[PDB]
Structure 1
Amino acid sequence: HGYVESPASRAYQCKLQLNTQCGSVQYEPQSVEGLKGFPQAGPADGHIASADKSTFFELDQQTPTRWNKLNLKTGPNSFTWKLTARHSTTSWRYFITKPNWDASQPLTRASFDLTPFCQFNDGGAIPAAQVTHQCNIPADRSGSHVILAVWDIADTANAFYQAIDVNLSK
């Protein structure tokens, strides 16, 4: 259980009241939990941002202006998770939408480049309460994009999914 605090994820921005019409997740941003194994298995297409959890359905809405986007530069960026439960961890992966994705369609595997721009494999270790990853956001992305941070749990069937809405510039 945890969420990306910086750059603030869609779920966390819902808690901060920066996003609108978020429903349940604004009261529990740390619990966007679904099945692991993405992209071969995992949440179904169109249900990735909610991790296919019924009460988190609002997160699966997607339009060009639907979500509040953080202005970031491409290149070196830090991603920090705040964990409320430090579960034994298989991996942390950060994916970004394709260069020419469509923000007016639901998030599906076709929306994302399925080669993460960075990945950290922890071998089942128990993480600290705050975990920070430093990676380069691909420089060939500009404007509105979604970064999907995925945390796969080693000792359960689950993973946590954190969509992050961003507006990139050089």
Structure 2
Amino acid sequence: HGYVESPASRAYQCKLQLNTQCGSVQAEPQSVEGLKGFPQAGPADGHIASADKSTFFELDQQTPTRWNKLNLKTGPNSFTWKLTARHSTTSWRYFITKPNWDASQPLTRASFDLTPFCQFNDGGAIPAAQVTHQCNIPADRSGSHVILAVWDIADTANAFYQAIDVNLSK
């Protein structure tokens, strides 16, 4: 159990009062948990942001101005997870929407470049309460986008999904 606290994920902003109308998730942004194996398996299209968790379906809403977006530059960035429960870990992966993705429709695999721009494999080790990954956001991405940070658990069938709303510039 954990969430991306910086840049504050969609789910987490829901608790800080930076995002509203989220529902249950604002009570526990660290529990956006669903099946692992994305993108081959995992959350069904249209329910990726909520990890296909019915009680978190508010997260699946998608319109050009629905979510509060953070302003970031392409290139080097730092993503920090805050874990409320530390489990044996297989990997951490970050995906970003393709250029020209439809920001007026619910997220689907067709919305994302299915190859993560970066991946960290922990060999099953249990992570510290704070985890920070540094990756380069693709330079060909500008304007409104969604970065999906996925945490795959090694000893269970699940993963945690953290959608992050962003507005990119050079």
TM-score by length of 1: 0.99
Q: 1:132-166: CA deviations, max 9, x gaps?
A: 00000000000000000000000000000000000
Q: 1:64-84: CA deviations, max 9, x gaps?
A: 000000000000000000000
Once the two structures are TM-superposed, the CA of residue 20 in structure 1 deviates from its matched residue by 1.6
SS at match of 1:152: strand
Show structure 1 runs of 4+ deviating over 2 A. Answer: none
Unaligned runs of 5+ in 1: none
- Percent identical across equivalent pairs? 99
Q: C-alpha distance in 1, partners of 2:17/2:103?
A: 21
SS at match of 1:120: strand
Q: C-alpha distance in 2, partners of 1:37/1:145?
A: 23
Once the two structures are TM-superposed, the CA of residue 7 in structure 1 deviates from its matched residue by 0.4
Once the two structures are TM-superposed, the CA of residue 122 in structure 1 deviates from its matched residue by 0.6
SS at match of 1:58: helix
Once the two structures are TM-superposed, the CA of residue 100 in structure 1 deviates from its matched residue by 1.1
Q: 1:49-96: CA deviations, max 9, x gaps?
A: 000111101000000000000000000000000000011000000000
Q: C-alpha distance in 1, partners of 2:159/2:115?
A: 18
SS at match of 1:93: strand
Specify the alignment match of 2:39 in structure 1.
39
Once the two structures are TM-superposed, the CA of residue 129 in structure 1 deviates from its matched residue by 0.3
SS at match of 1:25: helix
Once the two structures are TM-superposed, the CA of residue 2 in structure 1 deviates from its matched residue by 0.2
TM-score by length of 2: 0.99
Unaligned runs of 5+ in 2: none
Once the two structures are TM-superposed, the CA of residue 27 in structure 1 deviates from its matched residue by 0.6
Q: C-alpha distance in 1, partners of 2:166/2:80?
A: 15
Q: 1:24-53: CA deviations, max 9, x gaps?
A: 000100000000000000000000000011
Once the two structures are TM-superposed, the CA of residue 8 in structure 1 deviates from its matched residue by 0.3
Once the two structures are TM-superposed, the CA of residue 17 in structure 1 deviates from its matched residue by 1.1
Query: What is the number of residues matched between the two proteins?
Result: 170
Q: 1:27-106 to 2 correspondence within 5 Å?
A: 27-106=27-106
